[PDB]
Each structure stands twice: as C-alpha cells, then as structure tokens.
C-alpha cells in the first residue's frame, strides 16, 4: 500500500546507515529528493557470518536511526548480507510463470548447500519480452538461507518498520548509477563495492548486469592487519587506517602502515585480476572500458590509482546523490560527496522504495 518507504544499510557491518528520499516540491514542481540521512557505527554482536544475531540490539540501533532522521515513515526496503546470499546465473526454458518458478527451484536445488529451508528469487538477465516459447531463458537466482531473512524481519518488526523489499546490495548499489549507465549501452562497465565484510564486483553492458562475484576480502582485512602489526584494538586500528592513511601530515606513517597493509593490497589486486580473468569468456581479443567504486573500503587513499594501474581499467569514485534532488539549504554538497561511497546502497534500495 503506497507510502514512500525507507532504506537502511542493514548489512553495513561497520555502519548502519539510513536514507529518506521522497518527492520534494519547489515552485509547483516536484521530484525525488533527499529528505534525510543518518549513520551509526554498528554495535557488533549484532551481525555474525551475515546473520542478524542480536535482533534486539539491532532493533534499538535502527530506532536510533529513525529518531536521528526525524522521519515519520515506518515502511522500509533493506538488503541481505553478501555473505548470506548466493547469486548466480541459470539457463532454462521460459514458459508459464509457475513452470518457471518450479523449474528454477529445481535447478537451484543443485546450487544450494542447505535444505530449502531457502529463499529463491530470480530475475531475467534479458527481457523475456524477446524470445519464443521453450527458448532462450536466462534467470539469475538470488538464494538465501531462510533466517538470515527471518533475523532481519525480526529486527525490522520490533523497530516498528514494515519491510516491502528485501533486495541485494550488489544490484541495489547500482540504482544510483543506473541512469548514467543506461546512457552508454554497449559499453562494458565494472562496479566495485568494497565494503567491510565483502567486496562485490558486478559487470554490465549498459545498466544490464552481465555478472556478479563476491570476494571475502574487504576493509576489515586492512584494519585487521594494522591491528595485528601494532597490537591495537579494532577501533584504533580503524582510525589509524582512516586518518592515518590520508592526512596531509601522514608522511611518516605510510611506511609503517603501508608495510602493514601491503599484503592485503597485493592479494586484493590478485583477487580482482582473478575475477576479471574468470569473466573474459567470449572476447579473447578485447580490452576493458570504465569502472566505478562504492563502499568505504574504496576510500583507502590512493587505492583508486592502484586498482587503475593494476587492473588495466579506469577506476573512478562516483557520486550517487546526483540521481536525486538535493536542497543546498539542508545539505552541504561537499559532505554529501564525502560520504557518498558508504551511502551508495543506502540510497540504492531507497530509490527502490518510492518506485
């Protein structure tokens, strides 16, 4: 039933973020526009292995998010953990919708290392509106062990929220750039979301996803190596990462820190070259085009130049908030730009919510 819902970053692991865009009126005209945004560091013990495992504490945190937001809306879209979802493509024959859903569940049964006991939702990589009966089916299945979804629904229920869409982050992060992707439509673009629990790669022709791949490595790895090499707590190692790696006065600390994070840098580069090579299936004589970054782990100083020179692709930060109207009297464009990578998904399923 129509409200403009809301959007949290429920699988932030480092941070629970939430965004309210609705249609803001100006001079008799209206359009999607940022109304509020809030962010709180996730209190751990909330999430373990991608499952919400202190539904109570997470509830109270989400309530703090709603209060800081000053939002009256109580409907929400959210996302599952990348560690909690299996995403992969699947080839079938299209037919009746029931026969597809059953046949989909039958093929993915092979694909799921758990009982069902499992969440199945597909979408077709090409418009069904393009092919004849019995021919040329392609669906991608998102499958999730059951009570990741439960845990999240408990969290949402006691926060006073009502969920309408439980989406996935690798595609929700794309809704902000889906227009700017839709304008170049034979161009192959990569999108990396370097988070705290996982790094997702999704590669597209236009805003048409060609594939996705999720890598266990993330920013938690850099923080954990800093912590190892200076027997620090996770918080002070995290700050040493953030402010340590990027200050103008940091000239003495990129040896001490960079020598700590160098293994992670090499090995991340190795994983990304790994996935990219595992895609290049059909065009044995071509090259790449252009790619963007999201997630706070991206904001590692100089990491964009490093990925650019190492993967042979131009890797650029991007401002999601360009998709939405922003009142300059209520929001500073500079800070908005600063927190854009962390918030990409946080506005992602948020354009999913007035949709």
């Amino acid at each position: 039933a129509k409200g403009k819902l809301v959007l949290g970053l429920d699988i932030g692991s480092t941070s629970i973020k939430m965004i309210l865009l609705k249609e803001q009126r100006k001079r008799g005209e209206v359009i999607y526009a940022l109304q509020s945004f809030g962010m709180k560091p996730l209190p751990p013990e909330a999430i373990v292995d991608g499952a919400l495992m202190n539904s109570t504490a997470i509830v109270q945190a989400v309530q703090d998010l709603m209060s800081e937001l000053k939002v009256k809306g109580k409907d929400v879209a959210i996302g599952v953990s990348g560690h909690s979802v299996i995403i992969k493509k699947i080839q079938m024959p299209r037919m009746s919708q029931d026969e597809l859903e059953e046949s989909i569940q039958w093929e993915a049964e092979q694909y799921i290392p758990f009982d069902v006991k499992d969440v199945n939702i597909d979408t077709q990589i090409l418009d069904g509106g393009g092919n004849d009966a019995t021919g040329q089916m392609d669906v991608l299945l998102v499958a999730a062990k059951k009570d990741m979804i439960n845990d999240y629904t408990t969290v949402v229920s006691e926060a006073g929220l009502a969920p309408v869409v439980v989406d996935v982050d690798a595609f929700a992060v794309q809704n902000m750039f889906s227009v700017n992707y839709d304008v170049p439509e034979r161009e192959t673009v990569v999108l990396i979301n370097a988070g705290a629990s996982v790094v997702n790669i999704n590669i597209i022709s236009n805003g048409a996803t060609v594939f996705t791949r999720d890598v266990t490595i993330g920013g938690n790895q850099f923080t954990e190596e800093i912590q190892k090499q200076l027997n620090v707590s996770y918080e002070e190692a995290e700050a040493l990462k953030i402010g340590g790696n990027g200050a103008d006065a940091d000239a003495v600390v990129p040896q001490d820190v960079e020598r700590v994070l160098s293994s992670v840098a090499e090995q991340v580069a190795g994983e990304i070259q790994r996935s990219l090579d595992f895609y290049a299936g059909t065009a044995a004589d071509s090259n790449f085009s252009k790619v963007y970054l999201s997630g706070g782990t991206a904001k590692i100083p100089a990491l964009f130049k490093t990925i650019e020179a190492r993967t042979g692709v131009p890797v650029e930060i991007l401002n999601p908030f360009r998709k939405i109207e922003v009142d300059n009297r209520k929001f500073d464009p500079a800070f908005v730009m600063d927190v854009a990578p962390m918030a990409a998904v946080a506005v992602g399923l948020a354009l999913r919510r007035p949709g």
Binding site: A1, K2, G3, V164
Partner: protein
C-alpha cells in the same frame, strides 16, 4: 506494496458497492436486534398475564 493504498485512498464502483454493502449489513443487524427485543418484551408480558 504501493498501488493498493492508492486504490484504498481512491475508490469508485467497487467501493461504492462496498459501502452500500456495509450499510445494508448494519441495517440488517439493526432490524434483527429490533426483532429480538420484542421477543424479550413479549416473554415479559407473558409472565405478567400468567401471574394475573
């Protein structure tokens, strides 16, 4: 799941018919109560008459 609070805030034939139906249901509740009460009153007049 939006288009349904748009439909729930709107209406035309389906909800005009619906409202007519809730009204006739209320009126039938009313007339059934208004035939249950003369029953009780009637048993009362019975108890009086027999006592006479």
């Amino acid at each position: 799941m939006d288009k349904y609070l748009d439909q729930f805030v709107k209406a035309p034939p389906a909800i005009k018919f619906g409202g007519l139906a809730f009204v006739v249901g209320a009126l039938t509740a009313a007339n059934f109560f208004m035939v249950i009460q003369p029953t009780e009153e009637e048993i009362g007049w019975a108890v009086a008459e027999r006592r006479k």
